[PDB]
């Protein structure tokens, strides 16, 4: 019939430990890197399948929400998708009211408000998913991180996943505020190289960019061109 009590409660130290444990699910996930350049945002993640038998052109970790908003995760695969199909639905519920493409900050405020609700509603665990969300609205690029608590943060560049603390130190060295988009894709790929454990190819990662032409994830023919440099 459904449990009506919160599974996330405060610990005596003042902590919501089910959220703090859902962060541990995120920090064990595959590394995801977002970089906001001056004319675009690049979202790159490690799409490293377990075996050769897995179809790489089947499921996607960089998913578009609108024509101008895409997002990527570190954490749990299936919790991402319930959260990425509601994000696509919240984006069209805005568009039916306002007939304007949703601002990127407003989508992140609606997605994180959902993620807050499964930290307080009855009989549910939080999501084990953080989200790097990108978008282009009003001539400005946007990059947000949505933590499993439901808190959102606008980032110039950040990283999640395994070795995120080592990776986010690598962003603080090689991030110029006045980069272009084509120079930010290389620095996003290099962060996925700082912890990869192998030889990364066009199928072992997944890159998504968002410029004023909208959001799109890069084709594996286009990923190979950036790996040559």
């Amino acid at each position: 019939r459904g449990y009506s009590f919160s599974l996330t409660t405060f610990s005596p130290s003042g902590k919501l430990v089910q959220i703090e444990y859902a962060l541990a699910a995120v920090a064990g996930g595959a590394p995801s890197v977002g970089i906001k350049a001056a004319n675009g945002v690049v979202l790159a993640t490690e799409k490293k399948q377990k075996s050769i038998l897995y179809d790489e052109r089947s499921v996607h970790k960089v998913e578009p929400i609108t024509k101008h908003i895409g997002l990527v995760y570190s954490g749990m695969g299936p919790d991402y998708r319930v959260l990425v199909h509601r994000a696509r639905k919240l984006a069209q519920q805005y568009y039916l009211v306002y007939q304007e493409p949703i601002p990127t900050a407003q989508l992140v405020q609606r997605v994180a408000s959902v993620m807050q609700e499964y930290t307080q509603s009855g009989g549910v665990r939080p999501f084990g998913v953080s989200l790097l969300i990108c978008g282009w609205n009003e001539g400005r690029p946007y990059l947000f991180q949505s933590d499993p608590s439901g808190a959102y943060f606008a980032w110039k560049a950040t990283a999640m996943g395994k070795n995120y603390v080592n990776g986010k130190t690598f962003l603080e060295k090689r991030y110029n505020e006045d980069l272009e988009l084509e120079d930010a894709i290389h620095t996003a790929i290099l962060t996925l190289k700082e912890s990869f454990e192998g030889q990364m190819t066009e199928d072992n990662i997944e890159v998504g960019i968002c410029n004023e032409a909208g959001f799109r994830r890069l084709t594996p023919t286009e990923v190979k061109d950036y790996l040559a440099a």
Binding site: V97, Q99, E100, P103
Partner: protein
Amino acid sequence: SIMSYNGGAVMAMKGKNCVAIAADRRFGIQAQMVTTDFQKIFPMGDRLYIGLAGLATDVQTVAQRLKFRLNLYELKEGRQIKPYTLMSMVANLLYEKRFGPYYTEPVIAGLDPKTFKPFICSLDLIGCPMVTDDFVVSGTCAEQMYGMCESLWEPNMDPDHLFETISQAMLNAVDRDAVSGMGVIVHIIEKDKITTRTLKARMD
């Protein structure tokens, strides 16, 4: 015809880098006036006004339901609304009660808050948006000021020509309508200022 109960006439006209909106001042019952100061034009922005005619309980309700939703919008979105987006906000509000509609046909008139691009619109009672570049009318004397603004409107008017056009098209229409009149208020919305002139009309 229930929208002729209180009467009323609102008209919005586009100029060059400026818009004008105008309404009558009469509040009434089927043929009886009560006040001559009834507000039908409401400030939905810095330089963006909505004008509502029709049944006067819905002129007051929809302007308050829209001020409800716009203040939620301007706090959450952190910016002022664009005049195209207010149009879709009103069109959602009027269609959400489609069966049993709000008996108002609002016009909006404003400037784009980051382009100063002029915008006028008109909606039906169940929210069908009409964007025009010439003029929009709404009210009891619609046909009086359709043909009145088909002659007087010229493209690319100065703010002083725009005031003398929308005010000669309101006065000649509501003096030919029985349940519209008792004054005309005109807002000229320009980039630097909002000028508001009530003007001498026939009080019959």
